[PDB]
Amino acid sequence: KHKILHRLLQ
Amino acid sequence: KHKILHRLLQ
Amino acid sequence: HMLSDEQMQIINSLVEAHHKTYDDSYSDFVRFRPPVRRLSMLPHLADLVSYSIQKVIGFAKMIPGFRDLTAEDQIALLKSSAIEIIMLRSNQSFSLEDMSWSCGGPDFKYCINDVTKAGHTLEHLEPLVKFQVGLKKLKLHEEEHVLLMAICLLSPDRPGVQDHVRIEALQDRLCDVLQAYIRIQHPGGRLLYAKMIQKLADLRSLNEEHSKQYRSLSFQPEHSMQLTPLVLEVFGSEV
Amino acid sequence: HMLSDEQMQIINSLVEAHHKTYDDSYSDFVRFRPPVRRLSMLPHLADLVSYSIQKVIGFAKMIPGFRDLTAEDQIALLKSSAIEIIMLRSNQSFSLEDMSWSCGGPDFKYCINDVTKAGHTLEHLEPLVKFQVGLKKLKLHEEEHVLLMAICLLSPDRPGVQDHVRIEALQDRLCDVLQAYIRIQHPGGRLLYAKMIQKLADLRSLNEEHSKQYRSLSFQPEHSMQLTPLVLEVFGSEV
Ligand SMILES: C=C1/C(=C\C=C2/CCC[C@]3(C)[C@@H](C(CCCC(C)(C)O)CCCC(C)(C)O)CC[C@@H]23)C[C@@H](O)C[C@@H]1O
Ligand SMILES: C=C1/C(=C\C=C2/CCC[C@]3(C)[C@@H](C(CCCC(C)(C)O)CCCC(C)(C)O)CC[C@@H]23)C[C@@H](O)C[C@@H]1O
């Protein structure tokens, strides 16, 4: 869950 | 699972 | 009676943050799916909103002590605030002269009607426009505009937050800065801080009305497919 | 020695089907995120592929007796064939004169290089181009082009298929039509049917090489976010 967000938060 | 496909197949 | 050193440092960081995540030319709107005047604006508007989220994330990461929170809470805050942070930052392109967001035109001049061709009712768009005009009339120094978004984002009572103690803390520290800034740097800011905090609650309401009409929009696959992975992720229910 | 009545009926349906789901003007490519010459073509190409899927679904629904399958198998078939059906139909815009898909230009003229700016290696793009040229050299009547896609789609050994008995059945019936058509309507079609069935296996291989490089592409969130909900759904693993 929340694959993209984690990534975007370096 | 496959929400969109089901819909697209009327 | 004068601004602190740790307080200028904070203001400097937040203004630079917004400077690097907001474009006054809007020169990326060409890379979005074109606007069309069913729900012809949905593709474009979803691309616009998705774009904005990435910027909000850029900004958020630069808010002081935000990188120090747990990845979990960072997500919990973005998810809850995201939409409000957008209504906030959109004001910068809103125009009282014509009551519409002008990021270009006639292509990129969004009016209440457009957001209609994207799945929202006027009976709910009205308050957002009202909120924009009131906010625009507050003629905010960018320092205040920025602090307002950084405070709105750190709002302690978001569904899903864990450490609500440290979050009310970093938000209190920010509020000090704001109250100090207005009193010290803003001629005739007697009533301002209050009016500003008043805006935050206007946002909670606007946020709610959105979650409702987006839920209905996201439950129809023919519509959800018009969205982006990021939007779906940010306005989704996964936990 | 002559074409059946139930066989003309089938051919008529399939050609009309393709006629209503393929545009020789490509007048919807403007509604996609613009192409850009990182992975600058990914947004555009993902929009193109997503668009094509919806068309393939339109076509599939009109293949005879396809609506009679279970929703489950319909999905199982689309998911497995989709990509191949696209490589198939793309040939219609491929150009041996310049070895590239020309759906316009210079904007919509896609060359091997572009698909590179979308996350694929030349060491794997080469065979797809080869496949296009061979297919183009077969100078197919549209009747054959259409039957080929309808047969490719009904290919019995797709991962996830349940009733593989009725599926090999509706595909055998189609193959009859094709072999009958070439023999009867195609001057010098002695070797054709064989060459055509040969193409199908070229597709299984091309399909595989895709699943691999897409998996790697879909596992990086910065990239997957550039995709569409439909693409993600169709090339996904959910079952
Ligand atoms: C964003 C920015 C801009 C405009 C903001 C707008 C104009 C279009 C409609 C928007 C985006 C509102 C809508 C969009 C929701 C569409 C969606 C995701 C498909 O449910 C949300 C408000 C919906 C209400 C609550 C009114 O019902 C909120 C702010 C509005 C342009 C620029 O200022 C950058 C800024 O960054
Ligand atoms: C489609 C159509 C068209 C072109 C097809 C193309 C050109 C661009 C690259 C494509 C789309 C290939 C790629 C696209 C995959 C990109 C993605 C989804 C991000 O992994 C697939 C092949 C990849 C290989 C196997 C070569 O590694 C397959 C067919 C190629 C245009 C028109 O003919 C409509 C048709 O409808």
Host domain of residue D185: 1-239
Is D22 labelled a binding residue?
Answer: yes
- CATH number reported for the structural domain that contains residue C133 in this entry: 1.10.565.10
Instruction: Mark whether C and B touch (3+ CB pairs within 8 Å).
Output: yes
Q: How far is C122 from chain A (nearest CA, A)?
A: 31
CA D230 distance to own-chain centroid: 16
| Amino acid type, D72 | E
Q: How far is the CA of D231 from the centre of ligand 2 (A)?
A: 12
Number of the ligand 2 atom closest to the C-alpha atom of D92: 33
How many structural domains does chain C have? 1
Are C140 and C148 within 8 A, CB to CB?
Answer: yes
The helix (run of H) or strand (run of E) holding residue C100 is: strand C100-102
Are C162 and C186 within 8 A, CB to CB?
Answer: no
Report which of C82, C104, C85, C84 is spatially closest to residue C93, judged by C-alpha positions. Answer: C104
Q: How far is C138 from chain D (nearest CA, A)?
A: 37
d(CA C202, CA C214): 18
Q: How far is A1 from chain D (nearest CA, A)?
A: 12
Report which of D183, D178, D148, D48 is spatially closest to residue D103, judged by C-alpha positions. Answer: D48
Interface of C with D (CB under 8 A): 30-34, 36, 43, 47, 224-225, 227-230, 232
Question: Residue D65 — left, alpha, or beta (φ > 0 → left; ψ -120 to 50 → alpha)?
Answer: left
Residue C92 DSSP symbol? G
Which ligand sits closest to the CA of C43? 1
Question: Residue D33 — left, alpha, or beta (φ > 0 → left; ψ -120 to 50 → alpha)?
Answer: beta
CA dihedral defined by C86, C87, C93, C94, rounded to 10 degrees?
170
Q: How far is the CA of C126 from the centre of ligand 1 (A)?
A: 13
Which ligand sits closest to the CA of D21? 2
The residue of chain C with its CA nearest to that of D35 is C31
C102 forms bridges with which residues in the sheet? C109
Radius of gyration of chain D (CA): 18
C224 and D224 within 8 Å at the Cβ level: the answer is no
The 3-class SS string of chain D reads CCCCHHHHHHHHHHHHHHHCCCCCCCCCHHHCCCCCCCCCCHHHHHHHHHHHHHHHHHHHHHCCCCCCCCHHHHHHHHHHHHHHHHHHHHHHHEECCCCEEECCCCCCEECHHHHHCCCCCHHHHHHHHHHHHHHHHCCCCHHHHHHHHHHHHCCCCCCCCCCHHHHHHHHHHHHHHHHHHHHHHCCCCCCHHHHHHHHHHHHHHHHHHHHHHHHHHHCCHHHHCCCCHHHHHHCCCCC
d(CA D55, CA D108): 18
A9 and C61 within 8 Å at the Cβ level: the answer is yes
d(CA C130, CA C133): 5
| Ligand 2 pocket, residues with Cβ under 6 angstroms | D 45-46, 48-49, 52, 86-87, 89-90, 92-93, 101, 103, 110, 115, 118, 120, 124-125, 128, 206, 209-210, 213-214, 231
Pairing state between β C100-102 and D100-102: unpaired
Residue entry with tokens 């009867």: D184
Edge-to-edge strand order for the sheet containing D100-102?
D94-95, D100-102, D109-110
**For atom 12 of ligand 1, which residue has the closest CA?**
C87
The helix (run of H) or strand (run of E) holding residue C36 is: none
* Cis status of the peptide bond prior to D229, with omega within 30 of 0: no
The residue of chain B with its CA nearest to that of D230 is B4
Are D217 and D119 within 8 A, CB to CB?
Answer: yes
Residue C163 near ligand 1, beta carbon < 6 Å: no
Task: Show Cβ contacts of residue C53 under 8 Å, excluding neighbours closer than 6 positions.
Answer: C78, C82, C86, C230, C231, C234
Quoted resolution (Å):
2.8
